[PDB]
Design a protein around this ligand. Sequence first.
Ligand SMILES: CCCCC/C=C/C/C=C\C/C=C\C/C=C\CCCC(=O)O[C@H](COC(=O)CCCCCCCCCCCCCCCCC)COP(=O)(O)O[C@@H]1[C@H](O)[C@@H](O)[C@H](OP(=O)(O)O)[C@@H](O)[C@H]1O
Ligand SMILES: *[C@@H]1O[C@H](CO)[C@@H](O[C@@H]2O[C@H](CO)[C@@H](O[C@@H]3O[C@H](CO)[C@@H](O)[C@H](O[C@@H]4O[C@H](CO)[C@@H](O)[C@H](O)[C@@H]4O)[C@@H]3O)[C@H](O)[C@H]2NC(C)=O)[C@H](O)[C@H]1NC(C)=O
Ligand SMILES: Nc1ncnc2c1ncn2[C@@H]1O[C@H](COP(=O)(O)OP(=O)(O)CP(=O)(O)O)[C@@H](O)[C@H]1O
Ligand SMILES: *[C@@H]1O[C@H](CO)[C@@H](O[C@@H]2O[C@H](CO)[C@@H](O)[C@H](O)[C@H]2NC(C)=O)[C@H](O)[C@H]1NC(C)=O
Ligand SMILES: *[C@@H]1O[C@H](CO)[C@@H](O[C@@H]2O[C@H](CO)[C@@H](O)[C@H](O)[C@H]2NC(C)=O)[C@H](O)[C@H]1NC(C)=O
Ligand SMILES: [Mg+2]
Lengths: 1064, 350
Amino acid sequence: PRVIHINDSLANSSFGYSDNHISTTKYNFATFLPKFLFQEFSKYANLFFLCTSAIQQVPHVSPTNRYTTIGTLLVVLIVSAMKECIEDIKRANSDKELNNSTAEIFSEAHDDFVEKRWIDIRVGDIIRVKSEEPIPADTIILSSSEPEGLCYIETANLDGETNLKIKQSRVETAKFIDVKTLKNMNGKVVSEQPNSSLYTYEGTMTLNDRQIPLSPDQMILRGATLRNTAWIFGLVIFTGHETKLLRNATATPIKRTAVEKIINRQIIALFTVLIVLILISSIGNVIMSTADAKHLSYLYLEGTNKAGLFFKDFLTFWILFSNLVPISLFVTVELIKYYQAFMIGSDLDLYYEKTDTPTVVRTSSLVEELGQIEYIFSDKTGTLTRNIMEFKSCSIAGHCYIDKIPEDKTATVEDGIEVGYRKFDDLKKKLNDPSDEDSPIINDFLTLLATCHTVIPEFQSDGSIKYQAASPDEGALVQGGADLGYKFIIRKPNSVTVLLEETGEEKEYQLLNICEFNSTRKRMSAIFRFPDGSIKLFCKGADTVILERLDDEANQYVEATMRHLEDYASEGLRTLCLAMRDISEGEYEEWNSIYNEAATTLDNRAEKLDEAANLIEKNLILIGATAIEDKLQDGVPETIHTLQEAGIKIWVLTGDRQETAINIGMSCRLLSEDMNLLIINEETRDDTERNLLEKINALNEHQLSTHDMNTLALVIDGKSLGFALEPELEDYLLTVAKLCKAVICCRVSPLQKALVVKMVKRKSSSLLLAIGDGANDVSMIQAAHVGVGISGMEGMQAARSADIAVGQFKFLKKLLLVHGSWSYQRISVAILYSFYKNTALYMTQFWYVFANAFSGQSIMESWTMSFYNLFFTVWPPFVIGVFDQFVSSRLLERYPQLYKLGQKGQFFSVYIFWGWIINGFFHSAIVFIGTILIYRYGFALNMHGELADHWSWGVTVYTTSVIIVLGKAALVTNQWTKFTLIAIPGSLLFWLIFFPIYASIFPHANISREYYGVVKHTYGSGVFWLTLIVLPIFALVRDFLWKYYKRMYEPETYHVIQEMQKYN
Amino acid sequence: TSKKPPNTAFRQQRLKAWQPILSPQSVLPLLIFVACIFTPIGIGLIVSATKVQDLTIDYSHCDTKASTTAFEDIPKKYIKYHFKSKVENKPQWRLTENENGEQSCELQFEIPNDIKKSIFIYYKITNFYQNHRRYVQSFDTKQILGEPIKKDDLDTSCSPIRSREDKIIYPCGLIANSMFNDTFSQVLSGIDDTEDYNLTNKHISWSIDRHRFKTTKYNASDIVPPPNWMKKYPDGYTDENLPDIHTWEEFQVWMRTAAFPKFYKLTLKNESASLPKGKYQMNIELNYPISLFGGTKSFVLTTNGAIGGRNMSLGVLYLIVAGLCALFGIIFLVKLIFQPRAMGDHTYLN
Ligand SMILES: CCCCC/C=C/C/C=C\C/C=C\C/C=C\CCCC(=O)O[C@H](COC(=O)CCCCCCCCCCCCCCCCC)COP(=O)(O)O[C@@H]1[C@H](O)[C@@H](O)[C@H](OP(=O)(O)O)[C@@H](O)[C@H]1O
Ligand SMILES: *[C@@H]1O[C@H](CO)[C@@H](O[C@@H]2O[C@H](CO)[C@@H](O[C@@H]3O[C@H](CO)[C@@H](O)[C@H](O[C@@H]4O[C@H](CO)[C@@H](O)[C@H](O)[C@@H]4O)[C@@H]3O)[C@H](O)[C@H]2NC(C)=O)[C@H](O)[C@H]1NC(C)=O
Ligand SMILES: Nc1ncnc2c1ncn2[C@@H]1O[C@H](COP(=O)(O)OP(=O)(O)CP(=O)(O)O)[C@@H](O)[C@H]1O
Ligand SMILES: *[C@@H]1O[C@H](CO)[C@@H](O[C@@H]2O[C@H](CO)[C@@H](O)[C@H](O)[C@H]2NC(C)=O)[C@H](O)[C@H]1NC(C)=O
Ligand SMILES: *[C@@H]1O[C@H](CO)[C@@H](O[C@@H]2O[C@H](CO)[C@@H](O)[C@H](O)[C@H]2NC(C)=O)[C@H](O)[C@H]1NC(C)=O
Ligand SMILES: [Mg+2]
């Protein structure tokens, strides 16, 4: 039991409950290393280098300095740490900006609510939350500004439900309205423990004398939002991380890409070749130590114990060759992906002006995957359409009315039953005079438009009234009645006031009861009481549900309305049927007792209420139908066509029937006038299996020509899709879906889109893209590979949980064609170059074992080799992976076929990996032999007959190696910007200026005692400036010639496109 | 409060740049220019390397395969020479031993032309890996600088040769122990109407060596010679026999680790006058046995070159680059002439 006092902040503090601060930071200034170290030492390179530096602590084993590997390791570690700290500070900024907000807490001494901060709120405080502002914590309501004690909370954060919940206070405590009388109430609230079950609460609030029970009907969670109430009084019972909703928060799992697996395979290959090289070197060492043990006596070798000598040689070669796995890659690729994520949300072409919402990339670990997507599971409403509704047409009393009549069927042909289009003026002319028979039906329709809804109107200072509608179609129906002449005005509780512009007098209708919307019902019923004293029932719903519950003997215009639903469904416009019935008092008093039967069962409300209402909706009289249109977004007919041109099969999921989906697909340029539609509409499971078998055997028996393989589409319904996804039948649907070009699913259940996505992703090798809107398909985004959330009016739930937030569907044409091709082409070249620049240098240590008797002697210095990975070869990679464009963005959307190059995997494969590796091996062997042929006896100097040494040659090797690496980088680049000259030649100049300063300053500090006088023997010698010119060209001529040959005689698509870009 | 991203040239990836074109008109001139600039440099380098006139005599096996009573001819297998003129008299050698069995090899050769450049004399040692890991780093620098380092503060690199018979070894290092000790005559003895030719023995090592190798400040009862120095310096170190590593320049030259088992070591030089032609004789105290390292010692007399000394690796590399360029350029030219690409159009090859 959680005993909670009401009016003393000192009494509940003795329990020591949590505070109100929300912690969203990953690290902290108190416990930082014990977690960051364990997080960092979890991959492969980190643990490998840690073990290397740990082994490099034994004496007479390390070929170089004792701190040549721990330096780079600590540098990359502190780089990762400072990046994590920067992101933690950026998160804590918004954390404090959200926590330092204002909140009103009651004061016992002041006897009034004082303004304070959110973080000062404790468990047990009495708070007063103002007009339509959200609840600060888990509070139990004491009173409210509403007379009974009710309020309206919005639960779009703790659920996906879009309606508002009626949370009411108890009537035995709602009499505390005034702030000055809040001091005279004493008692305790025996609450439950903190949980995460949202819809269940149990408590016991004891008042001055006796206890009252509590329930989740007076429990308001933190993600909710107060609405339609001036203020409320709440009692904080759970705060901070002790609430119901933020207790066990969900954690996003690690989403890995295929490029990561290719990198893992390449690292395994590098480890294997490392083991092979170490084994060969150790074998050479042991055989030369055993064979020439008599001539190598001046070294005073062991000889008497070779078991330890072999292991020591193994450790020495391991320490010398451990630099073959560059740890700089795991940081370089991460920073490149981070910059690429930053450079996406910085483009105006991905920014919406009508809403002021740019692209927000939440996860940068899935940026290259934009260049290899094959399926797109897009939504219709919200994604394709503008999510706005407009009342276009109505059909009542067997007629049909529009304002803008087109001249194709302006002539009503009078083919028996009237079909055609008449003006709204003749609607008002048959509305004005009361002598017509249809005018009581026309007015019962036009009141059903303005009364049956649940819109809350509001006035402004300009006088233009704004309607607050829970659905945009009802709001467009209300605005259609308002501009048609029946303006809807002030709505107070339990009555509706309507301003009638025909007579000029303002009427009013007494609202008796409304039944809420349900997806199982797809209805909405509302009993009313009139100025006549008569009780009428209004009911709106789909044509597929209410047409069974009519009296067809009474009405005579059902066939006209069904043909108007047939030519309405031929244009894809969503429609609703409107029905009414006069009822008597005795049946309303019984259905009131059936409603108090449902009021008695709070445990069961989904089963009891909705079918208790359907006891009284057994029979209705049809008034007619309405037609609300939904405008399509701009650019969609072009974007979808461009995506289909590139070879991307699109799956459009529409929550309507078959014909509407076919119409909206034909209008959206998704299909064509000659595309074979494999309609699959069957109910029996065995019949669906037979249909699938017939389709597949009719398709496989004949060949598929070039026109037949492109002109194929699939159209499926909801029931057929639900019956075609069984573990024993999904293979047929999968193998029949890969042949068509566009899939159109109709009447799809919300919880089945994620099922389709998981089915496609579990038995295929392609990457998916789930774009949608609203919390109804959030499961589609959290389960696919590359999720996309459109910032719309249906709620910002999808935008906060999607990997990329996009303004509209028009932007995808530039998100997957340019920012996908580039994001998949840059990272591959960057990784290949990072491998090549390391293998081409740290391999001379292996080619040198043929000259130092396989001793494992370092050819170069100890600190220069470590600086090679920090100050000389870290800028060309960033330039070639961020600031390089192999093709212009203007000439990339025109030829979408280039996306196929990224859709298959042509610029990144293990074959090209081994090619770059063997090219680096070739360059290493070339520089080694070219240096050993020149530095033969060391007599290559003209300074009074003085000779070279072991270091003046290693320095030359290092300089030639870095020059060749920079030359290869320059040959790889595609665009010569003003930032490349500071990376590739800038590094060369940096080395040429830094080497003399280092060699002249540092040796005087007992740190690098191997550079004494090497400056004169290198710069002053005429061999340096000659080898640095004769060797790099000799090593790069092969790559230059091969690139010219593949560009000239055997080009590809991107080659020809770049040629046309350069020449035109 | 406007969340609109900036509009410029960097935030829009609209930076000015240039795209390189691999057109044959932009490739063939490059290669022909590379060839036309590398051919003269290559021929100049090979001409400069041709002017190196030197000599090398493998004086090994002089203790067994050389005569004693007269100067017998040296087999052509050992002698090597590159001079402007031809050699008329074959180099000869003799074995002469004195007191205490101190054997010595007397070589006699003939220089057929006056060398105008300065002369240098090295000893080439083969199959003596100085670049071995256990050999290059095994020497202390503080003892070279001249300080009385205690026993417990000695360098751990010279571990085996460290503190013998509980006495601090002065040159703790494998490089100092295995030192080449074939004393040269310091002068070429001219024979038959030919004067001698004095040589300089100092100022041969690096400047930093002469600046760092300072004379030690030890005593004479705490330092002992290494096991390979017991002959020339018997009865341990004394107040007078204490060597001075600042003037003893051969020790400074030998400490510089070479790069490959085929190396030189500067011993004698003369940069003051020209060496006239004639017959010369050189005495070498055969003290370094070739059986200790399994290689072959050699006395080498060279001059000096702008690039090095009798080596054409740079020239042949220049020639290889020029040949590859001039070959591939003409190959691609005749390939585009006899059969052009004719593939400039896309032709919808998607
Ligand atoms: C005395 C004369 C000296 C002449 C020297 C000449 C040597 C030539 C040797 C081989 C060339 C043979 C034929 C030449 C003709 C064609 C070459 C075919 C080249 C080839 O497609 O695959 C390459 C592998 O290539 C080696 O990695 C090269 C293979 C090297 C393998 C080395 C094997 C081990 C060697 C160790 C020797 C050690 C010996 C011991 C010495 C030390 C001890 C003494 C792949 O890497 P790559 O970066 O170039 O990839 C290219 C390139 O990126 C670009 O052109 C293309 O992109 P784009 O078109 O879209 O822009 C791209 O599609 C791709 O084509
Ligand atoms: C020129 O350089 C030659 C190469 O080092 C060198 O030849 C070696 O000289 C050393 C020094 O005498 C020799 O080492 C001695 O070897 C004998 C066995 O042949 C050992 O018995 C001897 O140890 C002895 O130990 C006794 C007890 O501790 C001690 O009292 C004795 O004094 C003595 O130290 C030495 O270890 C070595 O065998 C020689 N040959 C080789 C291949 O190393 C020349 O002497 C040197 N000549 C000159 C003039 O400098
Ligand atoms: N107040 C309401 N009362 C009864 N039926 C309604 C209704 N509002 C919508 N409907 C009907 O419910 C059907 C499907 O359920 P829902 O209400 O969730 O619409 P929906 O999710 O399909 C939006 P869209 O049709 O644009 O895809 C719609 O076709 C609509 O005709
Ligand atoms: C220059 O050469 C002459 C001989 O050409 C050297 O004179 C000899 O010196 C040695 C040294 O002990 C004597 O044993 C000889 O008797 C000398 N010969 C003659 C003819 O004088 C002279 O020492 C050399 N100069 C230097 C500085 O060594
Ligand atoms: C280089 O060699 C020349 C030629 O022998 C040396 O010049 C001789 O030096 C000695 C020194 O005693 C003189 O006696 C001779 O007269 C000199 N020769 C001539 C022709 O004048 C020169 O000294 C040597 N350089 C050195 C040893 O540094
Ligand atoms: Mg939607």
